[PDB]
Every structure is written in structure tokens, then in C-alpha cells.
RNA sequence: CAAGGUCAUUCGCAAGAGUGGCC
RNA sequence: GUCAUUCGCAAGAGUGGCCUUGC
């Protein structure tokens, strides 16, 4: 019985599962991703589903649901889970958390098969068996979330021998029991309803190899902690390091961290996701950047430090000489500068003898109370912009923009909206005109 | 013993196998390909290796060999073989053709395992068994090519339980026997040396499931046909439809077709690959295309048909009225024309009453003895260019080119070189400056 | 030497746009 | 309604170019 071999299709079933619902979304607004996965021997992230062998069944079902590339949380979660490592993932709503665990878990089940224990037991007959032993257990806080997880499981278990089931409180136990008795390899459950099934001898967790806690922060908020601990610690479920455990949550309070240390073994912490700073963006042609900078400098207080960012080292030297001949006390720093020359420049800047510092990205990585940060040249990527403006200690950041910075028009626009800053209407216009 | 699981690496092996040699070549000057695969229920081609699940070992070894995407012959051969169909593949030398069969075959062996027959026999001890039963046999005409096939097999069998071996004539039979005695699952062989090995009781073909005849045209020219027939038809090799047979050849003579019908079962025919047409390319700005066309028409003999291709239906109507108001008897045809209007236009064209036909791509698909085809607008792709100029019978083709046609500068340059035509120096110059 | 970003060409993919051809 | 090509944007990869940073 090979579980990696797809079973014959059903045109009827395909339409019910894939025609509508949660098909793929363009996760491009978010593609400028701050994502970090820290842990011992952390498996590297993926850029395509092909970078790991999901298997024939999963790749075909991904093609039916119309996903093309992994979401940023999936880029890390999928290789982490397929390497059989535990995962603590803090990801905001709409990141693709559900598929981030369903895809690797089901892929592993297809490759490994049901295991020796299930074969050694009486095969689930046409009249079923009273008690079922799920290979994988997913815990959810509500019926709504549990049903949504279950629906995605059907899409990814299409043409497989994995039969998903879902049980939730506030419903008829009779339907759920009768649905369980037809086989259950992946179970989605609210905690209270799952405890009832275990007490009734309908569900056994002796062979549960994949445990997922979805929306874990909410489950604690709703008072499900005793049920979860009864499910995991006070029963037959294999312990940490034998089972493969994953916790997903939108927030990371200390209550979730303490639960992670109790439930997860040698795990990876995965996190996905500047408002005390006034930010201005102005259109400036290249030949006008110097004159625009002079007006800002002529408007600066007597004892306010100004940090001016430029793209190239030659541009930094050229801008320093220009400002000096214009009569402005300034200094400069870049990568070619010796450590002594950097110290001399910073000494003048900190002392205030030269309250203007012309710097490349060398000062974006903090070498040291700057009041004004000026992007004389905007950086080529939005990550550099964040590091630059964070040098302020009220704090102001002014950036020069022209057609050369069109590569960050949307990324900069998203940042201004996200930081509750004010948005030039022409920036929105150029963004939509350039991308649609 | 799971054969889909990679075995531990070896830094030495990686360097010896992958550091140099024939790593990937960008099959980019040949992205524009005439490739047709014809046969009953022919599996669709692929565009990346991900489109079929090759397995962890294969995808890992592909990355080490620096292959990015399948070559045009690989796009069809890989899915055809992976679906267990026989293949008659005619492709020129240097097409990525060795890997076109090694990758799907080894992937199948990794997934299917060694089969029941091998598991029921004595394991190859460290004093290995005497007689070997290769799962896959590859036949080559010379030692040189056989070694070259074998070396690629080493790279793709890296970290696998598949052990390749190569035997060829004009060498010490002694080394080959004891290299075989250490185990052999995939065998590369020249026909003469293989016949000897069978007669020694060293090689058994009872379990060979994948038979490959590489450079089959040369093998027949070198007199290997009786040895091949003895190898395939007069021994224990499983017959067609049980074994999976592939034949590769740079040419497709009648002698190869007859051999394919004898050896291949329900096979697919795969083929990969205008000199009596003088072709001219001239730079013409858009505002000058009408004046340039007039000079050519005034230089046309009184009784010669000219076919003028344009991009849009509106362009066809506009060009017709312009020529008419200039005193040139002409007509036009495009997709929006009713069948009656098309017949009227063709009637005037073939009678010579209006020897100038202004047409869109609607006339690029055969509808006469046209003496001059003029690309007033060059098509957006080179395939359309071939179909347009093919309407001549001496026949001449003159094409207008400007910056709008930069998207086919390289493809048109390759075509003119391929068809032994004169090449404007500016066309090469613009091609290299645009792509490098 | 290593690490990062952007651009140009190419390949696939998704969304859009434009042209063409078939009914 | 179906089909083909091109172009814009976006993801990735390969090549090239360019810039930045660390010894
Ligand atoms: N690889 C992907 N590509 C495109 N869209 C995806 C992908 N993975 C998930 N999605 C979509 O993201 C949306 C959110 O799914 P969901 O799991 O509910 O996010 P979350 O659970 O973190 O709130 C769904 O519409 C889903 O189809
Ligand atoms: N998918 C690929 N991507 C890039 N290069 C490839 C690919 N496949 C093969 N090649 C290269 O193409 C060249 C031709 O290999 P070969 O099999 O001998 O062509 P052929 O057999 O048609 O004469 C080799 O250098 C090989 O490494
Ligand atoms: Mg060859
Ligand atoms: Mg092109």
C-alpha cells in the first residue's frame, strides 16, 4: 500500500474543493518581508515549493488550489517541519499559517506511509471501527477556525488515503462520532470536544506523530489550557522529541512562551513582522538635490545634528566639498575611510564642530542624538531606509525622491501607511501607475 | 531498504564529480525551438524539473551539476519516460540528451526501488556475486561516448544505492569484470563487449526494465545491429511493453525507423529541429515605412506578386487606402474580413489585377506564387517570420526593422545565420549590446 | 576573498495590458 | 467562448553589469 501514489480523480470532487473558496492571493504587498528564524541548526528557508520534495500528491494539489510560491512564513516553516523540527511560529493573520503546517505534515505522511502500528491493527472495515488513532492532531479554538483548517486539509488530502475529520463543541456529537468511525488520520478539534471523544473511547492519541496548536494565544485566552494539557501531557500522546509539535500564534505573550518550552523540543522560533519619527518625501530632480539640501540646512537650528545619506563614496566626498565651499561646517564618512578618518569625522560630528555628516550606508549600521536624517539619495531597497531613519533620537526624516527611486515607490508607500505617516498623493499615483 | 533516501555526502566525491566537466550550458540561443512530440496520449511537456516530482536525490544532484531548467528535448523526454512510455527521440548533438533519459530512469529506480527479484537474491557481499543483473542498460557505439554517459551517471547516482558501470571494447576485460563484481544496477556498454560479458555468465538481462540506445544511427553504421539484436531479441531481456525502451539519434533514416518499430511499444516520436529565399533586413523608422515600401514597389517587375505583411487590421486598411490613393492597385485581407471579402481580395491578387496584397497573420497560414514577401511590420516572434517568408516560391523577402523589433534581434540574427543569409553588421551589434 | 542591494538580458510562473487569429 | 505571441509589474533562478559594506 503505497501512500505516495495518487488515487484516481473525481471531476465532481475537484470543483467542490477548488473552484472557489480560499484560492491563492498575491502576497506582494508583504513581499518586503522582515522574517527571522532562530534556533539550533535551523534548516534554511525555501524560495519555491520545488526546493523540497513535497511529493506528487501535494504538488498536484497545490496546483489545483492555485498557489504558486510559498508565503514568507511558509518559506521557513515548510523546510523546518519537513526536517522534523519543532516550530514556534508567531505570524499575523493572513500569512498562510494553515498551509504552512498542512503541506509538510501531509507530505511526510504520504512518504512515510501510515506506519507499522496502523498496519498491525484491524483495517478499518466497511462498518468502521469504534476507536480511531489519528496520525496528526490540529487543535483550534473555535468551530469557525477548525472548519476552515479542515477544508484546507480536504484540498491537500485530495486523492490521498489520508481522511481528515473535524470535531468541535456546540454541535451534535453523534454526527462527529459517526464521521470519525469512517476513519481518521488527520484530526482538527477544539479542545473541549476532543476530551469528550477520548473519554468515550473514540479517539486514541497513541500514534499521534504531528501535533499542531493553531491560534494558540486565543486558546489560552478562551480558557482551553487545562483541556490542552490533559490532551497532551495526561494521556497516551507520545512525548516531545518523539512527536513533532508545532505552535502557531498571532501574538507571543509570555504565556505562549512558557507553553512552548513545555511542549516543544529543540525548536525553532519563527517571527514574521518607526512611528516616533516624522517622515517627509519630496520630489527632487537630480540637478536640484543640492539646492534643496541647502534650504533644509538653512532652516536647521543652531545646535541640531543632521545626518545626510548618499549612495556612493564619490558622491559623499563631492557633497562634502560642495557644502564646505558653500560655508557649511560638515564632515563625511564612508567605507574607504580608514578607522582614524572615521574617528576624526565622528569626533567633529559629536562635538558639534561639524553638525552635518555626509555618509553612505556605512553609518546606517549605527556607529553612534541625531535630530534630522536626510536621504539625499534614497536607497535601492526599503530595508536600508528603515535602518537610516532609525538614527534619530523631535526626530525628523526627509527623503529626496525622483524617477531613479521608482523601484521602491510601493515599498516606501506601504511603509508610510504602516507607520501612520502622511502620504503624498503623487506617491500613491505613481505607485499604481507603475504596478497596477 | 528505502532507495529514495539520500545517503551521506562525501566532500571528495562532490569535488571530483561536479567541480568541472560538462556543467550547465544556457540553452538560450536555442530557446526558440521547433519541437514536436507525436503519439497516442502523449504526456504533456514540462517547463521546469518541478513539474514532475523527480525525487530528493535527483533534484539534489541536478543542483550540483548546475542545471536550471530542462533543455527543449528534456522538456518532452522527461515526462514521457516518467510516465513509462517508449520514446523515439531525434535530436542534434549537444541537446542535453544524455540527461534526458538518465534523470527520469534513475528517478524511477529510486522511487520503485530495486524490485522484488533483486531483494530475493544473495546480496552483493564484499566478495561480490559473480553474475550481475542490471536494472537499466544503455548502449553506445564507442568507448568515448560510453565513458561520457557513464560519468554523467556517476553524478546523478551520487548518494544513491544505484551503482553505475561501463564496459567497452578495446580494453582489459579483466578490470571490467571485477568492476562489475562490485555490483551493477545501470550498465553503459558498447554492443560487442556486452555480448562477451553475457557469454561469460557475468551479465544477465532477466531484470532489465530500462533499455536505452544512444546514438542509434551511428551504432547501425558501425555494424552493431547483429550484436544489438542478439542483446535484445535473442536472450532473456524482457520484451517490449514490459521493459521501457528509448532510442536517441541525431538522424532519422529509414533504418532507424524500422529498428524503432521492432524495439518500441506504443512509442512517441520526438523531433527537435529556407535557403532558396533571399532575405533582407533594413532599418526603417516608423514614419519612413511608407516611403520605403513605395521604392520597393516602383522597382517591382510589372507582373510580379508582392505580399506585404502588417501588424494590425487597422494598419492593413490604412496601408491599402494609402497605396490606392498613390496609384498602386492593391487589396487587403485580415481576420475581420468576411469569407466573401477574402475571396474577392484573393481573386484580385491571383489574377494580377491587384498584385499587392496587404495582409495580417491571416495570410501567414497558407491560402500562391508570391515573388516578394515584405515585412512592413516584423512579427513579435520569430515563428511568425518563418511562416510569412515561406509564402515565396526568384523568391525574395524584405523586412523592415526598428527599435520596436528589438525583441527578435537575436532570434532574427540566429535565423539569418542558420539559413546561410547575409547578416547586416548593425544587427549583430544591436543584438550583443541588448543581451551581452 | 566574503556578504547585501539594485539594474539589464534570459527562463518559467502569477496578475494585468495590448495585438493577432479560430467560432 | 477558445487559441497564439508580445509588452508592464511581481516571485524565483541563471548570466552579466553596477553599487554598498566587512577583512
Ligand atoms: N503559497 C500561497 N500562495 C498564495 N496564497 C496563499 C499561499 N498560501 C496561503 N495562501 C492564501 O493566504 C490566505 C490566508 O490563509 P490563512 O492560512 O487563513 O492565513 P492565516 O491562517 O495565517 O490567517 C488564504 O487565502 C490562502 O489561500
Ligand atoms: N538542463 C540543462 N541545463 C543546462 N545545461 C544542460 C542541461 N542538460 C544538459 N546540459 C548540457 O548540455 C550539454 C550536452 O550534453 P549532451 O547530453 O552530450 O548533449 P547531447 O547528448 O544531445 O549531444 C552538456 O554540457 C550538458 O551538461
Ligand atoms: Mg549524446
Ligand atoms: Mg524573446
The domains found in chain A, sorted by start residue, are 11-271 (3.40.50.300), 277-435 (3.40.50.300)
Q: DSSP assignment of A74-103, as one string? A: HHHHHHHHHTT--EEEE--TTS-HHHHHHH
Interface of chain B against chain A, CB under 8 Å?
Answer: 4, 48-50, 53, 55-56, 59, 111
Please indicate whether, in this complex, the C-beta atoms of A53 and B56 are within 8 angstroms of each other: yes
Is A360 known as a binding-site position?
no
- How close does chain B come to A49, measured CA to CA in Å? 8
Whether B221 sits with its Cβ under 7 A from any strand C atom: the answer reads no
CA angle A392, A394, A399 (to 5 degrees): 55
Q: What is the CA radius of gyration of chain B?
A: 28
- Nearest nucleotide (C1') to the CA of residue A406? C6
C-alpha cell at B300: 517591382
Which residues on neighbouring strands pair with residue B179, listed in sequence order? none
Cell digits for B75? 522538456
- Whether ligand 2 lies within 6 angstroms of the CB of B25 is answered as yes
In 3-state terms chain B splits into helix, strand, coil percentages (rounded to 5) of: 40, 15, 40
Element housing B88 (H / E) = strand B87-90
DSSP run (H or E) holding B206: none
Which residues of chain A are within 8 Å of residue B43 when distances are taken between CB atoms? none
**Cβ contact A244:A84 at 8 Å:** yes
Does A93 appear as a known binding residue? yes
| Chain B residue closest in CA terms to A63 | B51
- Rounded distance, CA A256 to CA A248, Å? 10
Q: Which residues in 24-53 of chain B line strand C, with CB less than 7 A from it?
A: 26, 28, 31-32, 47-48
Compute the nearest-CA separation of B46 from chain A (Å): 14
Annotated binding site of B for ATP: 67-74, 91-98
β-sheet with A278-283: strand ranges across: A278-283, A396-401, A372-375, A306-309, A356-359, A330-333
Ligand 2: centre distance to CA B76 (Å): 15
The sign of the CA dihedral B48, B53, B56, B61 is: negative
CA A56, A60, A65 angle in degrees (round to 5)?
150
Residues of B in contact with A4 (CB under 8 A): 111
3-state secondary structure of B404: helix
Nearest nucleotide from residue B435 CA, by C1' atom: C9
Q: Which residues pair with A282 in a beta bridge?
A: A400
Q: In this structure, is the CB of residue B318 within 7 Å of any atom belonging to strand C?
A: no
Q: Is residue A72 a known part of a binding site?
A: yes
How many residues belong to chain B? Answer: 436
Q: In which element (H, E) is residue A400 found? A: strand A396-401
Pocket test for ligand 1, best of A18, A33, A99 (most atoms within 8 A of CB): A99
Instruction: Measure in Å the smallest separation between the Cα of B44 and chain A Cα atoms.
Output: 15
Q: Alpha-carbon distance B316 to B359, whole Å?
A: 6
The closest alpha carbon to A73, from A38, A43, A35, A44, belongs to A35
Q: How far is B8 from chain A (nearest CA, A)?
A: 15
Distance CA B44, CA B37 (A): 9
Cross-strand pairs, B135 = none
Ligand closest in space to the Cα of A214: 1
Q: Is the Cβ–Cβ distance between B48 and B69 less than 8 Å?
A: yes
In angstroms, this model's resolution equals 2.4
Ligand 2 contact via B249 beta carbon (within 6 Å): no
Q: How far apart are CA B76 and CA A15, in angstroms?
A: 29
C1'-nearest nucleotide to the CA of B411: C10
In chain B, residues with a C-beta closer than 8 Å to the C-beta of A63 are: none
Does residue B94's CB lie within 6 angstroms of at least one atom of ligand 2?
yes
| DSSP three-state, residue B332 | strand
Q: How far apart are CA B67 and CA B59, in angstroms?
A: 10
Ligand 1 centre and the CA of B91: distance in Å?
43
Ligand 4 centre to CA of B404 (Å) is: 13
Here the cell at position B70 is: 530542462
Cell numbers representing residue B74 in the block: 528534456
> Helix, strand or coil for residue B101?
helix
Q: How far apart are CA A218 and CA A222, in angstroms?
A: 6
Cell numbers linked to A17? 474543493
Interface test with A, best of B47, B50, B56, B67 (most A CBs within 10 A): B50
Sequence-distant (6+) residues with CB within 8 A of A100 are A71, A73, A74, A77, A78, A81, A89, A91, A248
Q: Calculate Rg over the CA atoms of chain A.
A: 28
Q: Which of B237, B292, B295 is nearest to B263 (CA)?
A: B237
Report angle CA B76, B81, B85 to the nearest 5 degrees. Answer: 105
Residues near A393 by Cβ (< 8 Å), separated by ≥ 6?
A: A369, A370, A371
Residues followed by a break in chain B (C to N exceeding 2.5 Å) are 273, 367, 393
CA torsion, points A405, A411, A412, A417, in degrees to nearest 10?
160
Closest CA relative to residue A78, chosen from A57, A105, A41? A105
Distances (CA, A) of A308 to A281, A316, A357, A396, B103: 14, 9, 6, 12, 56
B333 three-state secondary structure: strand
Chain A residues in contact with B111 by the CB 8 A cut-off are: 4
Q: Considering only residues 294-333 of protein chain A, which place a Cβ less than 7 A from any atom of strand D?
A: 311-314
Query: B278: which DSSP letter?
Result: E
Q: Going by CA atoms, what residue is nearest to atom 21 of ligand 1?
A: A97
Q: Ligand 1 within 6 A of A108 CB?
A: no
> Are the beta carbons of A50 and B59 separated by less than 8 Å?
yes
Residue with cell 498602386: B328
Nearest by CB: B50 against A4, A48, A111: A48
d(CA A364, CA B187): 60
Give the determination technique.
X-ray
A94's CB contacts (< 8 A; 6+ apart) are none
CA A129 from centre of chain: 41
Distance from Cα B284 to the centre of ligand 4, integer Å: 21
Please report, for residues A132, A209, A238, A361, the alpha-carbon distance to residue A232 in angstroms, rounded to integers and kept in the order given. 17, 12, 8, 50
| DSSP H or E stretch at residue A376 | none
Gaps in chain A with C–N over 2.5 Å, residue before each:
273, 368, 393
What does chain A come to in residues? 436
Q: Which three cell numbers stand for residue A271?
A: 517571527
Q: Count of CB atoms within 10 A of residue A79's CB? A: 20
The residue whose grid cell reads 560487442 is B192
Edge-to-edge, what's the strand order for the sheet holding A35-38?
A35-38, A268-272, A87-90, A244-249, A210-213, A136-139, A186-189, A164-167
User: Can you tell me the distance from the alpha carbon of B108 to that of B87, in angstroms, rounded to the nearest whole number?
Assistant: 16
Residues 6+ apart with CB under 8 A from A383: A32
Which residue's entry shows cell 566532500? B11
Contact by Cβ (8 Å): A96, A27: yes
Q: Which atom of ligand 2 is nearest to the CA of B65?
A: 27
Give CA–CA dist A303/B331, Å, rounded. 80
Count H helices and E strands in chain A, helices first.
17, 14
Nearest CA in chain B to A55: B53
Q: Is the CB of B288 under 7 A from strand C?
A: no
Cα–Cα nearest to B76, from B106, B108, B110, B51: B51
A205 vs A137: CA distance, rounded Å: 8
Question: How far apart are the C-alpha atoms of B399 and B379, rounded to whole Å?
Answer: 10
Query: From the CA of B406, which ligand is nearest?
Result: 4
Contact of A83 with A133, CB cutoff 8 Å: no
> A96: Cβ below 6 Å to ligand 1?
yes
Query: How many Å apart are A3 CA and C1 C1'?
Result: 48
Helix (H) / strand (E) element for B398: namely strand B396-401
Burial of B290 (0-12, 13-18, 19+ CB in 10 A): middle
Q: Tell if the CB–CB gap between A50 and B49 is shorter than 8 Å.
A: yes
Distance from the CA of A74 to the center of ligand 1, in angstroms?
Answer: 9
Output the distance from B27 CA to C10 C1' rounded to whole Å: 10
Amino acid at each position: 500500500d503505497d501512500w505516495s501514489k495518487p488515487l484516481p480523480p473525481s471531476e465532481r470532487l475537484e470543483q467542490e474543493l477548488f473552484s472557489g473558496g480560499n484560492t491563492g492571493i498575491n502576497f506582494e504587498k508583504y513581499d518586503d518581508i522582515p522574517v527571522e528564524a532562530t534556533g539550533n541548526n535551523c534548516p534554511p528557508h525555501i524560495e519555491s515549493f520545488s526546493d523540497v520534495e513535497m511529493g506528487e500528491i501535494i504538488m498536484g494539489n497545490i496546483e489545483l488550489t492555485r498557489y504558486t510560491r510559498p508565503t514568507p512564513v511558509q518559506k521557513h516553516a515548510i523546510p523546518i517541519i519537513k526536517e522534523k523540527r519543532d516550530l514556534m511560529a508567531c505570524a499575523q493573520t493572513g500569512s498562510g499559517k494553515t498551509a504552512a503546517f498542512l503541506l509538510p505534515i501531509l507530505s511526510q505522511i504520504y512518504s512515510d506511509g501510515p506506519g507499522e502500528a496502523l498496519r498491525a491493527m484491524k483495517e478499518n472495515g466497511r462498518y468502521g471501527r469504534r476507536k480511531q488513532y489519528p496520525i496528526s492532531l490540529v487543535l483550534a479554538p473555535t468551530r469557525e477556525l477548525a472548519v476552515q483548517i479542515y477544508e484546507e486539509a480536504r484540498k491537500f488530502s485530495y486523492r490521498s488515503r489520508v481522511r481528515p475529520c473535524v470535531v468541535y463543541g456546540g454541535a451534535d456529537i453523534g454526527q462527529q462520532i459517526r464521521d470519525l468511525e469512517r476513519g481518521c488520520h488527520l484530526l482538527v478539534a477544539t479542545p473541549g470536544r476532543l476530551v469528550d471523544m477520548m473519554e468515550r473511547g473514540k479517539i486514541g492519541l497513541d500514534f499521534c506523530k504531528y501535533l499542531v496548536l493553531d491560534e494558540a494565544d486565543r486558546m489560552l485566552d478562551m480558557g482551553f489550557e487545562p483541556q490542552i494539557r490533559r490532551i497532551v501531557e495526561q494521556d497516551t500522546m507520545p512525548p516531545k522529541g518523539v512527536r513533532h509539535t508545532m505552535m502557531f500564534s498571532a501574538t507571543f505573550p509570555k504565556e505562549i512562551q512558557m507553553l512552548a518550552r513545555d511542549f516543544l523540543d529543540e525548536y525553532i522560533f519563527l517571527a514574521v513582522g518607526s512611528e516616533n519619527i516624522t517622515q517627509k518625501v519630496v520630489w527632487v530632480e537630480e540637478s536640484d538635490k543640492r539646492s534643496f539640501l541647502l534650504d533644509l540646512l538653512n532652516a536647521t537650528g543652531k545646535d541640531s545634528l543632521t545626518l545626510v545619506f548618499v549612495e556612493t563614496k564619490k558622491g559623499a566626498d563631492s557633497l562634502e566639498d560642495f557644502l564646505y565651499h558653500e560655508g557649511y561646517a560638515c564632515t563625511s564618512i564612508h567605507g574607504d575611510r580608514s578607522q582614524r578618518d572615521r574617528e576624526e569625522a565622528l569626533h567633529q560630528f559629536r562635538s558639534g564642530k561639524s553638525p552635518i555628516l555626509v555618509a553612505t550606508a556605512v553609518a546606517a549600521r549605527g556607529l553612534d542624538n541625531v535630530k534630522h536624517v536626510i536621504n539625499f539619495d534614497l536607497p535601492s531597497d526599503i530595508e536600508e531606509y528603515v535602518h537610516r531613519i532609525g538614527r534619530t533620537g523631535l526626530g525628523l526624516a526627509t527623503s529626496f525622491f525622483n524617477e531613479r527611486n521608482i523601484n521602491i515607490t510601493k515599498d516606501l508607500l506601504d511603509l508610510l501607511v504602516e507607520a501612520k505617516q502622511e502620504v503624498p498623493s503623487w506617491l500613491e499615483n505613481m505607485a499604481y501607475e507603475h504596478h497596477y
